[PDB]
């Protein structure tokens, strides 16, 4: 499956793509404002994620650091990135279907649209200004808006025991972006697409 990753933001981002234990495609690449990078993701990829990283520096061997979304200091991500990170999430060819969603469970750094480029389903979007409206105690000094699990490390926010409910913090994310996961047990906003669909992830989809 092809995922065209497009940077409409006015600033550079470093796209990242991983399934947690491995890179997807090259795993990461710089995208200046306006650039597009098309990756190929193996069919049957389960638990894939794509995200943006901001204010990164890499040296000649591709080691450095990112202020949001850092995946162990690599340009080419092999693991998931450090919160806060708005997340495009997908599992492909799962009994004949693709499943896609956007999640704020690991916080928010960059607005995002995640849409099929082929027929038979709709896209999802979290493009509100969550960074600018972020509650005081969630603001990440490094840039972006942390989820409450990251900040407070409680069973209620992290949903450790599997029994959590919505919270003042999760409700802020859900109000800004009704169509993204705001906590682990949020009512699903996952979209079912035909197996082997193709996709576009757009950073900063709106003005």
């Amino acid at each position: 499956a092809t995922f065209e990753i497009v940077n409409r933001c006015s600033y550079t981002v470093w796209a990242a793509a991983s399934k947690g234990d491995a890179a997807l495609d090259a795993g990461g690449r710089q995208l200046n404002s306006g650039e597009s990078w098309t990756i190929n993701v193996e069919p049957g990829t389960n638990g894939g994620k794509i995200w943006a990283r901001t204010d990164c520096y890499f040296d000649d061997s591709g080691s450095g650091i990112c202020k949001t979304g850092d995946c162990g200091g690599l340009l080419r991500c092999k693991r998931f990135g450090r919160p806060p990170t708005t997340l495009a999430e997908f599992s492909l060819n799962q009994y004949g279907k693709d499943y896609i969603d956007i999640s704020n469970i690991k916080g928010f750094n960059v607005p995002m649209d995640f849409s099929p480029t082929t027929r038979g389903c709709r896209g999802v979007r979290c493009a509100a200004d969550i960074v600018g409206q972020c509650p005081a105690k969630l603001k990440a000094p490094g840039g972006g808006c942390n989820d409450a699990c990251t900040v407070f490390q409680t069973s209620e926010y992290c949903c450790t025991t599997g029994k959590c409910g919505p919270t003042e913090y999760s409700r802020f994310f859900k109000r800004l972006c009704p169509d993204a996961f705001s906590y682990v047990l949020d009512k699903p906003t996952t979209v079912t697409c035909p197996g082997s669909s193709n996709y576009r992830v757009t950073f900063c989809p709106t003005a």
Side-chain angles (χ1 to χ4, degrees), residues 107-125:
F108 176 102
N109 63 340
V110 170
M112 173 195 278
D113 179 279
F114 182 16
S115 287
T117 51
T118 52
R119 68 112 216 140
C121 59
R122 68 176 176 281
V124 286
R125 183 174 290 203

Side-chain angles (χ1 to χ4, degrees), residues 6-40:
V6 173
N7 184 19
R8 179 164 317 141
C9 301
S10 61
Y11 46 84
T12 303
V13 304
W14 286 255
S18 171
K19 69 177 182 64
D21 58 349
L24 300 175
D25 198 279
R29 214 207 78 170
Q30 177 169 334
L31 269 66
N32 294 321
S33 174
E35 290 185 326
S36 301
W37 175 39
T38 303
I39 63 169
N40 286 277

Side-chain angles (χ1 to χ4, degrees), residues 5 7 15 19 34 48-49 52 58 63 81 115 125 129 131 133 135-136 144 158 161 168 181 186 188 203 207:
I5 309 173
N7 184 19
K19 69 177 182 64
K49 299 190 196 302
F58 297 104
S63 295
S115 287
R125 183 174 290 203
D129 184 17
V131 173
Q133 305 293 0
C158 306
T161 71
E168 178 153 331
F181 283 82
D186 207 348
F203 301 124

Side-chain angles (χ1 to χ4, degrees), residues 105-193:
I105 290 165
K106 289 292 169 181
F108 176 102
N109 63 340
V110 170
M112 173 195 278
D113 179 279
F114 182 16
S115 287
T117 51
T118 52
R119 68 112 216 140
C121 59
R122 68 176 176 281
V124 286
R125 183 174 290 203
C126 180
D129 184 17
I130 285 169
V131 173
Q133 305 293 0
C134 186
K137 291 187 176 141
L138 305 186
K139 287 176 189 293
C145 196
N146 290 136
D147 55 291
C149 172
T150 293
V151 175
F152 297 99
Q153 294 289 278
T154 68
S155 315
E156 191 60 20
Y157 295 140
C158 306
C159 298
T160 313
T161 71
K163 273 279 176 134
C164 71
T167 66
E168 178 153 331
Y169 293 124
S170 76
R171 281 178 193 97
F172 150 79
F173 290 94
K174 195 55 162 196
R175 179 179 63 78
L176 273 276
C177 282
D179 288 337
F181 283 82
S182 63
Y183 74 105
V184 174
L185 291 188
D186 207 348
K187 164 139 162 270
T189 42
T190 306
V191 172
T192 304
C193 294

